[PDB]
């Protein structure tokens, strides 16, 4: 029974390196040309633009959450798609509870911004949603108004 | 045995790691053009096509054209016609035998999802069936073009 | 100990069978309607059009490069997508001013062919990269028009 259960593990190690071949080859694949991996995080645009509310959604649907960068190195990778589709894209962050206070759809409050100078300025007294723009840097927008969707896994 | 142990549970860890980015990249893959329920998926190519070219498109993947057989795949369905704005066409025809809709292995319907008033052989000549945005179904000529969605 | 590594063993085998049966489900979901598997070869357009250098940046970024058939089995795999969306698309192949000839990006000669009765024939004088017709045969064509993207994994 010990030479069973030996055969019975060599047999599962082919099969996994089998699929961790495979699987490496798919990956490359599947991202391009709408999706951009950065450490444990993968982005991927929708290629339309949405309003917030129906963007959010879409994300939400999808078991995901609209783009969250929470470094500078996710903030460059998300950039790359949105430089690549030439639109600027909604990110999850909002105001909506306190002006000026931005939080993550959980409340949480940021540990990582790129505001462009001089923002979030409220143009408008109505500016509670974020956008990032073709450069990387971050502007707060109507959420009323279309953007790229980008949605985080 | 002890080299044994130390294999298996090398093993466990790798089949760990392996199954949680397959998870994550299958969520990936389904935005925005896919739906997962139970164990089917639903993707739509984007474009329109007639009836017998949709069918060789699917079947030329390894799937078929979208056949929900319960209200819960008719719904996930409904989801990417409602996305795209585009009424598809279902797998099923009543071809062979009028007013017989079957899947594309000659079984009889397990699920119908009919608007009223459907199906009703518009012409003398409607056979296959569209769905609507708003999930019901109507029987429609087989050379019109709708959204093509396979199953897999 | 030995019933131990049994039942070990046995959780692994039903782990693996289900990942075989996902993954394989999963790849046929990948390709349809973009990509073409053909030996260990992926072939998978984005389905728009760029001029030559953008093309080739964007199969490179993403881990790849060029459509590059290198058989008649790749060459009619190739051609199931450009028929698809009936747009000719690019290969990787350009015309060397240091080896006065077609070339491989390596620099390499061109092994397989498939070039259409009359070409290349540097219609103008400039027609320095290569595509490939809905009909799967090759024309040499200037690099600054747009043709369909299709990469290579
Ligand atoms: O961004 C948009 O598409 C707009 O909504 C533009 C709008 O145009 C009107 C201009 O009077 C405003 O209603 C609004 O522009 C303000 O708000 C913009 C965003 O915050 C909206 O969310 C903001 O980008 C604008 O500033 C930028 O553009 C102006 C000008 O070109 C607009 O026509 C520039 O003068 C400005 O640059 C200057 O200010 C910067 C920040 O203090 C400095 O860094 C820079 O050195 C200055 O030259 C900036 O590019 C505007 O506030
Ligand atoms: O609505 C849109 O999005 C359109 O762009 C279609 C156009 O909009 C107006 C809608 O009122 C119409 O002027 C026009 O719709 C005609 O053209 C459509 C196609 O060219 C593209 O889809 C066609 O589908 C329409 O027919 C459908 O809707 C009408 C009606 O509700 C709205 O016009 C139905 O009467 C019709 O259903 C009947 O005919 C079917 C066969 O054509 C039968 O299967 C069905 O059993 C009948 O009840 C169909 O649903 C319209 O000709
Ligand atoms: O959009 C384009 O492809 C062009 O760039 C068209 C241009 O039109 C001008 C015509 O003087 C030229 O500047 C250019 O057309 C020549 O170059 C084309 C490509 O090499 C561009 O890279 C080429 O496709 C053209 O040839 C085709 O048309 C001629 C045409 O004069 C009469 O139809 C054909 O003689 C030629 O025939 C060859 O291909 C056939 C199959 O399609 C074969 O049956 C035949 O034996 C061949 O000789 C070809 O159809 C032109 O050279
Ligand atoms: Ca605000
Ligand atoms: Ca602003
Ligand atoms: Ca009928
Ligand atoms: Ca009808
Ligand atoms: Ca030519």
Redesign the interface.
Same mark, same amino acid.
């Given at each position: 029974? $010990?030479a069973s259960?030996?055969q *019975?593990?060599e047999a599962? *190690?082919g *099969? $996994?390196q089998h699929? #961790?071949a =495979?699987?490496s #080859?798919? &990956? &490359? $694949?599947?991202?391009?040309?709408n +999706?951009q991996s950065v450490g444990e995080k993968?982005f &991927?645009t =929708? +290629?339309f633009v949405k309003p917030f509310t129906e963007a959010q959604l879409? @994300?939400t649907?999808? +078991? +995901?959450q609209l783009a969250s960068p929470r470094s500078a190195a996710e903030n460059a990778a998300l950039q #790359?798609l949105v430089v =690549?589709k030439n639109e600027a894209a909604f990110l999850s962050m909002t105001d909506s509870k306190t002006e000026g206070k931005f939080t993550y759809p959980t409340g949480e409050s940021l540990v990582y911004s790129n505001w462009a100078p001089g923002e979030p300025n409220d143009d408008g007294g109505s500016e509670d949603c974020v956008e990032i723009f073709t450069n990387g840097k971050w502007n707060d927008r109507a959420c009323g108004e279309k953007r790229l $969707?980008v @949605?985080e896994?």
């Amino acid at each position: 029974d $010990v030479a069973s259960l030996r055969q *019975q593990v060599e047999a599962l *190690q082919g *099969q $996994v390196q089998h699929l #961790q071949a =495979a699987f490496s #080859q798919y &990956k &490359k $694949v599947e991202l391009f040309p709408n +999706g951009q991996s950065v450490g444990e995080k993968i982005f &991927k645009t =929708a +290629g339309f633009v949405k309003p917030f509310t129906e963007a959010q959604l879409l @994300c939400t649907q999808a +078991g +995901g959450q609209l783009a969250s960068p929470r470094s500078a190195a996710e903030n460059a990778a998300l950039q #790359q798609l949105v430089v =690549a589709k030439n639109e600027a894209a909604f990110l999850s962050m909002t105001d909506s509870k306190t002006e000026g206070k931005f939080t993550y759809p959980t409340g949480e409050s940021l540990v990582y911004s790129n505001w462009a100078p001089g923002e979030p300025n409220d143009d408008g007294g109505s500016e509670d949603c974020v956008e990032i723009f073709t450069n990387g840097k971050w502007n707060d927008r109507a959420c009323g108004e279309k953007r790229l $969707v980008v @949605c985080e896994f």
